[PDB]
Design an enzyme around this catalytic site. Structure first.
Site, PDB file in Angstrom:
ATOM      1  N   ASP A  12     -12.855  31.381  52.802  1.00 46.90           N
ATOM      2  CA  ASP A  12     -11.729  33.213  53.384  1.00 46.90           C
ATOM      3  C   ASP A  12     -11.501  33.682  54.237  1.00 46.90           C
ATOM      4  O   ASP A  12     -11.614  35.392  54.366  1.00 46.90           O
ATOM      5  CB  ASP A  12     -12.429  33.609  52.332  1.00 46.90           C
ATOM      6  CG  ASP A  12     -13.343  34.712  52.402  1.00 46.90           C
ATOM      7  OD1 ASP A  12     -14.624  34.002  53.364  1.00 46.90           O
ATOM      8  OD2 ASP A  12     -14.522  34.773  51.036  1.00 46.90           O
ATOM      9  N   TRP A  19     -26.951  34.393  47.765  1.00 43.93           N
ATOM     10  CA  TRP A  19     -26.223  35.551  49.027  1.00 43.93           C
ATOM     11  C   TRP A  19     -27.319  35.890  49.674  1.00 43.93           C
ATOM     12  O   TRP A  19     -28.063  36.061  49.571  1.00 43.93           O
ATOM     13  CB  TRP A  19     -25.192  36.490  47.613  1.00 43.93           C
ATOM     14  CG  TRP A  19     -24.402  36.734  48.813  1.00 43.93           C
ATOM     15  CD1 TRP A  19     -23.143  36.073  49.765  1.00 43.93           C
ATOM     16  CD2 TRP A  19     -24.055  38.145  49.568  1.00 43.93           C
ATOM     17  NE1 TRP A  19     -22.970  37.622  51.140  1.00 43.93           N
ATOM     18  CE2 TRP A  19     -23.642  38.309  50.717  1.00 43.93           C
ATOM     19  CE3 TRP A  19     -25.813  39.318  49.378  1.00 43.93           C
ATOM     20  CZ2 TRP A  19     -23.946  39.957  51.661  1.00 43.93           C
ATOM     21  CZ3 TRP A  19     -25.752  40.348  50.552  1.00 43.93           C
ATOM     22  CH2 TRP A  19     -25.318  41.096  51.880  1.00 43.93           C
ATOM     23  N   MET A  53     -10.439  39.197  55.625  1.00 46.44           N
ATOM     24  CA  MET A  53     -10.521  38.385  54.773  1.00 46.44           C
ATOM     25  C   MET A  53     -10.627  38.556  53.324  1.00 46.44           C
ATOM     26  O   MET A  53      -9.804  39.748  52.608  1.00 46.44           O
ATOM     27  CB  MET A  53     -12.228  38.749  54.269  1.00 46.44           C
ATOM     28  CG  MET A  53     -13.400  38.577  53.426  1.00 46.44           C
ATOM     29  SD  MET A  53     -14.852  39.371  53.000  1.00 46.44           S
ATOM     30  CE  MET A  53     -16.203  38.324  54.251  1.00 46.44           C
ATOM     31  N   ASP A 113     -16.454  30.312  56.688  1.00 42.12           N
ATOM     32  CA  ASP A 113     -16.089  30.641  55.117  1.00 42.12           C
ATOM     33  C   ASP A 113     -14.776  30.103  54.842  1.00 42.12           C
ATOM     34  O   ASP A 113     -13.774  30.636  56.384  1.00 42.12           O
ATOM     35  CB  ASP A 113     -16.720  32.672  54.949  1.00 42.12           C
ATOM     36  CG  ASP A 113     -17.581  32.266  54.882  1.00 42.12           C
ATOM     37  OD1 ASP A 113     -18.837  31.569  55.290  1.00 42.12           O
ATOM     38  OD2 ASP A 113     -18.638  33.698  55.193  1.00 42.12           O
ATOM     39  N   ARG A 141     -17.178  39.320  42.597  1.00 41.22           N
ATOM     40  CA  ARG A 141     -18.151  38.847  42.463  1.00 41.22           C
ATOM     41  C   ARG A 141     -17.902  37.527  41.957  1.00 41.22           C
ATOM     42  O   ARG A 141     -18.112  37.339  40.940  1.00 41.22           O
ATOM     43  CB  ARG A 141     -19.253  39.804  42.110  1.00 41.22           C
ATOM     44  CG  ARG A 141     -20.629  39.386  41.848  1.00 41.22           C
ATOM     45  CD  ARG A 141     -21.936  40.393  41.865  1.00 41.22           C
ATOM     46  NE  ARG A 141     -21.659  41.008  40.452  1.00 41.22           N
ATOM     47  CZ  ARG A 141     -22.049  40.973  39.247  1.00 41.22           C
ATOM     48  NH1 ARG A 141     -22.568  39.653  39.377  1.00 41.22           N
ATOM     49  NH2 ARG A 141     -21.665  41.308  38.394  1.00 41.22           N
ATOM     50  N   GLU A 144     -29.090  33.732  55.780  1.00 40.70           N
ATOM     51  CA  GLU A 144     -29.074  32.821  55.819  1.00 40.70           C
ATOM     52  C   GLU A 144     -28.422  32.709  57.842  1.00 40.70           C
ATOM     53  O   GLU A 144     -28.992  32.319  58.014  1.00 40.70           O
ATOM     54  CB  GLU A 144     -28.351  31.759  55.188  1.00 40.70           C
ATOM     55  CG  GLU A 144     -26.848  31.565  54.884  1.00 40.70           C
ATOM     56  CD  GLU A 144     -26.142  32.647  54.991  1.00 40.70           C
ATOM     57  OE1 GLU A 144     -25.153  32.519  55.634  1.00 40.70           O
ATOM     58  OE2 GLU A 144     -26.523  33.441  53.324  1.00 40.70           O
ATOM     59  N   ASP A 145     -27.204  33.545  57.011  1.00 45.26           N
ATOM     60  CA  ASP A 145     -26.885  33.608  58.623  1.00 45.26           C
ATOM     61  C   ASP A 145     -27.534  34.257  59.941  1.00 45.26           C
ATOM     62  O   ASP A 145     -27.628  34.272  61.124  1.00 45.26           O
ATOM     63  CB  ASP A 145     -25.184  34.059  58.512  1.00 45.26           C
ATOM     64  CG  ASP A 145     -25.454  35.601  58.119  1.00 45.26           C
ATOM     65  OD1 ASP A 145     -25.979  35.682  56.864  1.00 45.26           O
ATOM     66  OD2 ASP A 145     -25.091  36.640  57.756  1.00 45.26           O
ATOM     67  N   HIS A 150     -12.392  39.616  46.794  1.00 44.82           N
ATOM     68  CA  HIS A 150     -12.493  38.613  45.836  1.00 44.82           C
ATOM     69  C   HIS A 150     -13.683  39.352  44.681  1.00 44.82           C
ATOM     70  O   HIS A 150     -14.077  40.179  45.232  1.00 44.82           O
ATOM     71  CB  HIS A 150     -12.887  36.965  46.035  1.00 44.82           C
ATOM     72  CG  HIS A 150     -13.235  37.064  46.965  1.00 44.82           C
ATOM     73  ND1 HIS A 150     -14.991  37.197  47.067  1.00 44.82           N
ATOM     74  CD2 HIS A 150     -12.821  36.187  48.506  1.00 44.82           C
ATOM     75  CE1 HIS A 150     -15.524  37.305  48.165  1.00 44.82           C
ATOM     76  NE2 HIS A 150     -14.586  36.774  49.030  1.00 44.82           N
TER      77      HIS A 150
END
Ligand SMILES: CC(=O)N[C@@H]1[C@@H](O)[C@H](O)[C@@H](CO)O[C@H]1O
Ligand SMILES: [Ca+2]
Lengths: 272, 123
Positions: free
Chosen positions: A124, A184, A214, A122, A219, A187-188, A217
């Site tokens: 971030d 969201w 991280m 990712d 949403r 998937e992981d 941020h």
């Protein structure tokens, strides 16, 4: 001329990671003169057996990217990896599809060089200890094991999100990642299920070495929680056969080679 | 507020065993349901789910947007967005008695095994 040592002698260990000061890529490029067009780097000191394509799913987070590049390029060079940076930019307005963009990164990176390892990250997440090597191991590797978001802890043992690394073989073995997870979440977990169904186990550095920060941020209205995610992860055993590398389709709208990275804007279609 | 597993576990003691669900199972469900965020809000399919338990205004609590739901829990949905969990827990108990644990879709796929990791040893 000779193989790089098992562990790099350039490591510093823990590092301070802050997202307060503004970043300037021109400065970043200045500090990292060894990085070539497209964000490529190869040790001139020794030969790294780690040919790593680092794949970053992306959409409208140029500021996070700036920090990512500012922190990782020096870290990755210290780790003595022969790597490439790939930002997979999702064009359009459909919900974000992290795993599909990672799949794209896998295929596109291979067009550039014969990479044998793939780190999916990712944009971030930043590692706080350069001992957490961004490369591949005998078993699929989960790298963001102690994110500050989760109190510098692994939230659940089945967690494979954030940053992970799979060798080419490991990735090919699970038919890559799913293409059907839009929005969201989950998937992981589907990927975690795939690895388990293929007889593999998740390797991880310990909680101290794997500390990560991280960049929080607001949403993303473009990445709302996927309502079908709970149903979808219960069916991986069957769907990994029909949804993955073997069913991946997309259109490359643009390939930009910047000094610090390669950015591929792709049209990955819409939720089917 | 993003609570810690132990903070949540301690807060929900009185739901332990209710309808057969353990605290280990609940810690697991709540993490995958709201990420332990007492202020979580997810709006979909014409309804909005609130708080740690992601209680829906479709039937359980009353909201402005959908002012005439059965409001089975007899509470305004906004009381499900603070750090006082007593009423959230009381409403979840009603859901457990009426609908059952499968109201929480995370339970079956993410919390059917490896429950020991969800224990909070902190007194
Ligand atoms: C099915 C689901 O929602 N899984 C999410 C996963 O996608 C996410 O990476 C992780 C950490 O935020 O939390 C899980 O609950
Ligand atoms: Ca409350």
């Amino acid at each position: 001329l000779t193989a790089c040592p098992e562990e790099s002698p350039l490591l510093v260990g823990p590092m301070l990671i802050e997202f307060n000061i503004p970043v300037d890529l021109k400065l970043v490029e200045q500090q990292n003169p060894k990085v070539k067009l497209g964000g490529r780097y190869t040790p001139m000191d020794c030969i790294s057996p780690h040919k790593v394509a680092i794949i970053i799913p992306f959409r409208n987070r140029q500021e996070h990217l700036k920090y990512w590049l500012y922190y990782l390029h020096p870290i990755l060079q210290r780790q003595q990896l022969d790597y490439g940076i790939y930002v997979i930019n999702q064009a359009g307005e459909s919900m974000f599809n992290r795993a599909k963009l990672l799949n794209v990164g896998f295929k596109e990176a291979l067009k550039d060089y014969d990479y044998n390892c793939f780190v999916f990250s990712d944009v971030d997440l930043i590692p706080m200890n350069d001992h957490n090597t961004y490369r591949c191991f005998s078993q699929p590797r989960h790298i963001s094991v102690a994110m500050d978001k989760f109190g510098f802890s692994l939230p659940y043992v089945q967690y494979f999100g954030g940053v992970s690394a799979l060798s080419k073989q490991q990735f090919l073995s699970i038919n890559g990642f799913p293409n059907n997870y839009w929005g969201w979440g989950g998937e992981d977990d589907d990927i975690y299920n795939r690895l388990a169904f293929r007889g593999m186990s998740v390797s991880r550095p310990n909680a101290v070495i794997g500390k990560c920060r991280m960049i929080r941020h607001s949403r993303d209205k473009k990445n709302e929680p996927n309502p079908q995610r709970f149903d979808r992860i219960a069916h991986t055993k069957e769907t990994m056969l029909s949804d993955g590398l073997n069913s991946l389709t997309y259109m490359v709208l643009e390939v930009q080679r910047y000094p610090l990275y390669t950015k591929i804007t792709v049209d990955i279609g819409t939720p089917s | 507020t993003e609570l810690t597993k132990c903070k949540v576990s301690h807060a929900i003691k009185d739901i332990d065993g209710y309808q057969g669900i353990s605290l280990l199972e609940w810690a697991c469900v709540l993490f995958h349901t709201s990420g332990y965020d007492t202020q979580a809000v997810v709006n979909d399919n014409g309804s909005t789910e609130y708080g740690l338990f992601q209680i829906s205004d479709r039937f359980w609590c009353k909201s402005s947007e959908f002012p005439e739901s059965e409001n089975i829990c007899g509470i305004s949905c906004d009381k499900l967005l603070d750090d006082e969990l007593d009423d959230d827990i009381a409403c979840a108990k009603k859901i457990l008695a009426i609908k059952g644990i499968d109201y929480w879709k995370a339970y079956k796929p993410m919390c059917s095994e490896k429950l020991e990791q969800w224990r909070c040893e902190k007194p």
